[PDB]
């Protein structure tokens, strides 16, 4: 697993790149996959820069923090822009949770340095909403 | 809901105080409540500084980020300190997730300020592992 600030931030950046693609370039694919009639689905981004919409981890507690569950359920009950914003915020929160899981053993200064790296990338919420 | 940097840190510090108590002073009761015989359980910390072990939220998708699911399923196969450390890191991650959920509308410099305040308190993992 990632342990150094550099390793963790590389992992963060790769997962983020995947989720950014899901919510922008591939947004029509992502949206279509989130059918409200299916079982609870989550949006995952992986360090190989792939994104997927899938069921949550079958075995619990999961090795990593898990994304928001059941994002598909609300898809057809709100305007698209509002649903994508909801997905984006939960995705930003998940990326942070994953990095600081890997970063549990970093000291206070290292954790601040890692957040600083993360904070130099616009949030998915910023991107999807087109924030000024 | 908390919106300013200060409001979000107040909420964070109260939930953290609750979780820290569960993992230390109240650990005998907390450990007991994480019954492997039950369905999947979670550890919640609330802004009134109460901690609670309960099933996950039924409202799906939930409003707030959700804590780690099924910590009771890991309790008996680990040494107590290792299990508490696992709960501690997932709980630290949940606290961060909750704060930056409330903080989604903060800008880059506001989020930096918020993290600086959060980063002024030892993490739950810091305390549980003796760092």
């Amino acid at each position: 697993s990632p342990r150094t600030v550099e390793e963790i931030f590389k992992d963060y950046s790769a997962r983020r790149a995947a989720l950014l693609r899901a919510l922008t370039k591939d947004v029509d694919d992502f949206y279509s996959q989130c059918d409200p009639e299916k079982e609870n689905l989550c949006l995952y981004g992986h360090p190989n820069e792939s994104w997927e919409v899938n069921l949550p981890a079958e075995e619990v507690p999961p090795e990593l923090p898990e994304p928001a569950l059941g994002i598909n359920f609300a898809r057809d009950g709100m305007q698209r822009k509002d649903w994508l914003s909801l997905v984006a915020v939960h995705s930003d929160c998940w990326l942070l949770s994953v990095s600081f899981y890997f970063g549990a053993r970093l000291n206070r200064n290292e954790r601040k340095r890692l957040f600083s790296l993360i904070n130099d990338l616009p949030t998915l919420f910023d991107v999807v909403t087109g924030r000024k | 809901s908390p919106r300013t940097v200060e409001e979000i840190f107040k909420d964070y510090s109260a939930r953290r105080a609750a979780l820290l108590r569960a993992l230390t002073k109240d650990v005998d009761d907390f450990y007991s409540q994480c019954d492997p015989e039950k369905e999947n359980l979670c550890l919640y910390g609330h802004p009134n500084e109460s901690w609670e072990v309960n099933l996950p939220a039924e409202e799906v998708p939930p409003e707030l980020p959700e804590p780690a699911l099924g910590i009771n399923f890991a309790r008996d196969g680990m040494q107590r300190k290792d299990w508490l450390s696992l709960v501690a890191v997932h709980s630290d991650c949940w606290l961060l997730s909750v704060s930056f959920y409330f903080g989604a509308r903060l800008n880059r410099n506001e989020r930096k300020r918020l993290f600086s305040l959060i980063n002024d308190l030892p993490t739950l993992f810091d305390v549980v592992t003796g760092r």
Binding site: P56, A57, E58, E59, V60, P61 | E39, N40, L55, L69, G70, F73, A74, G77, M78
Partner: peptide
Amino acid sequence: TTQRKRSA
């Protein structure tokens, strides 16, 4: 075991 299938 330290994991089980998630509850239904």
